[PDB]
Each structure stands twice: as C-alpha cells, then as structure tokens.
Structure 1
Amino acid sequence: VTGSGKKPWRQKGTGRARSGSIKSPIWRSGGVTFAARPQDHSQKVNKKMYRGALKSILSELVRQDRLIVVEKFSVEAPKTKLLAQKLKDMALEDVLIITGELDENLFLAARNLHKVDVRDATGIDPVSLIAFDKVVMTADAVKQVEEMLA
C-alpha cells in the first residue's frame, strides 16, 4: 500500500491505542491481511482415470438413448439455414455433432447456432458429452473413439 512507514504517534503519553503503521489492515485504507496473488487452479488427472470417466459417460449416454449414430452427416453449402432445416427433420435442437473429418461447410453452418456444436473425434471433452441433450456421432467417428479409449 502506498504510504510512509512513519509511526503515526508516539508509543506512550497519548490516550490512544498503539499505532505502528498507517497501512495496518485494522485501519481504513490499510492493506489486506492475506491479500491474494494470481494462482493456478488446474488439477492433475491420471490418464487412466480420465479415460475411465469418458467410457462411463459414453456408456450412460447409450443407456439413456442420448447417443445417436448415423452413417454420415454433412451439408451441401455453408449456410446456417440448411443445417437448421436438417436438424428439424431429425427432431434435434440441442445436439453435439462429432465427425471424423471436420468439414469446413458443416463447421461454418453451425457457428451461429448456439445450441449446436460441431467437434472432431479428437476434440471431445467430458463436460461437452454431458452438457448437450443429444450426441450425434458418425460411424467413422465411432471407430476413431475406440482406439483413443481402447
């Protein structure tokens, strides 16, 4: 805290409590007793534990019928209107789409839809698999996941 280290007043003689610094945390405008510092909140996750969690999540999705497998999933042009119409036919509104190859046309179409996310087979994370109501995975995408999880 900006200020001088001078004693505000002498130790004895005045009828006031002891003071040694104007920056004492007791005083107004003083420093914070345990002032915070920037810190890293990341935690370690064992490789096997992380892989085990993904397998449990995927199994639960199949149990709850929240996982849908399709032969292919693509759009003709990078237009949001086409993708939105496609999802209406399949009765999907909040879905996560995983594809083996991240087609640029599909990626651009889904950009403006905040309830739709397009991810690569290697880009799946545990939170995403749970956050979205439904998960759509292509047949080739299903194959890729198997070796990653083994």
Structure 2
Amino acid sequence: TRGEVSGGGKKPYRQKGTGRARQGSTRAPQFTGGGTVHGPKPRDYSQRTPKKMIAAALRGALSDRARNDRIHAVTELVEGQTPSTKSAKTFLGTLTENKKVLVVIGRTDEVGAKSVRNLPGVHVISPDQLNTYDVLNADDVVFSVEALNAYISANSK
C-alpha cells in the first residue's frame, strides 16, 4: 500500500506557489512506483460448511455413480510383493473403458497404489479421505473389498 513502499516520507515540494498539482508524497497511488490502493493482500479462502452437508454431498455423488453402475469392487489391483503398472493397467482396462477412475484403497496397501499411480487418468485416494470432488471427477469408482467395507462400516452406525 501507500505506506509500505520505499521512501515517500518527504512532501515532494512546497504546497503553494509552484503552479503544480498539490502532491503529498511521491509514493501516492497516482504516481509511478506509488502504492496500490485496493490491491490484494493474503487471504484464507476456506469456508466451513456443516458436516452433514459434506456427508450428504458424498452420499449423493456416490449414489449418482451407483445408479449408473460406475462402482466396482475388486479383491486387489495386482498380485502382491511387487508393483506392476502393466498388469494393473490391463486389469483396470478390463474393468472399465472410461478415462478417469477413482481407486479407493486402504492406506496399508502400498503395492496396489504403487502399481496404479502412474496411469494418466487414475486418481488414488483412501476411504477415510473420500470427498465429493474426486468422485465427481471419476467416470468410474473402483473400490477394494477392504475399502468398500471400511466406508460402509464407518457409516453403518
């Protein structure tokens, strides 16, 4: 702003008699190099929607995917002990033809998330982290048995 830019303390010249506009400092907004008037300052943009709004949006998006048969459960992405983007890609291709998929996996299952992480349209998220934005991106949502059961059980009571 006007007071944060360097310099500007002096009145530039005498206030009367010079035949020029009355100017209070060289860092005034109308000056080149002067202060910005209503300019951006850092902002926190988060807004806190009620919990059940968020939960309902989750359920509505997941229902929207379910009505159209876009939810899949699988035992796991790839046979374990080692990641393999090739085989996991082939299996996921059998499972769906669309471009974007959510792959909801439990956090412990690292071999599975490693083997599907480098596919261009594939987004990997944890069941306890499920939100409406990622499921609305996905054309299909591909759960694991453990992750589907976990989401069901976190909302069964």
Query: Which band: TM-score by shorter chain?
Result: 0.7 to 0.9
Q: 1:124 aligns with which of 108, 111, 130?
A: 130
Aligned position for 2:148? 142
Secondary structure at 1:2 match in 2: coil
**Paired residue total:** 149
8 A Cα contact 1:66 1:135, kept in partner: yes
Q: 2:31 aligns with which of 22, 27, 44?
A: 27
1:89-117 CA-to-partner distances (Å, cap 9, x unmatched) read 22344211113454111111112112112
Q: Distance in 2 between matches of 1:39 and 1:132?
A: 30
Aligned position for 2:21? 17
Q: 1:39 aligns with which of 29, 39, 43?
A: 43
Q: Distance in 1 between matches of 2:25 and 2:142?
A: 64
Say if 2:82 is the partner of 1:80. Answer: no
Q: 1:103 aligns with which of 101, 106, 109?
A: 109
Name stretches of at least 5 consecutive residues in structure 2 with no aligned partner.
none
- 121-130 or 101-110, larger mean C-alpha shift: 101-110
- 139-148 or 105-114, larger mean C-alpha shift: 139-148
8 A Cα contact 2:105 2:113, kept in partner: no
Name stretches of at least 5 consecutive residues in structure 1 with no aligned partner.
none
Per the TM alignment, residue 24 of structure 1 is displaced from its structure 2 partner at its CA by: 0.2
Per the TM alignment, residue 25 of structure 1 is displaced from its structure 2 partner at its CA by: 0.3
1:41-92 CA-to-partner distances (Å, cap 9, x unmatched) read 111021111111111111111123222234x123123111111121222234
Secondary structure at 1:44 match in 2: coil
TM-score (norm 1): 0.87
Per the TM alignment, residue 35 of structure 1 is displaced from its structure 2 partner at its CA by: 3.3
Q: Percent identity?
A: 37
RMSD: 1.8
Q: Which amino acid aligns with 1:129?
A: V
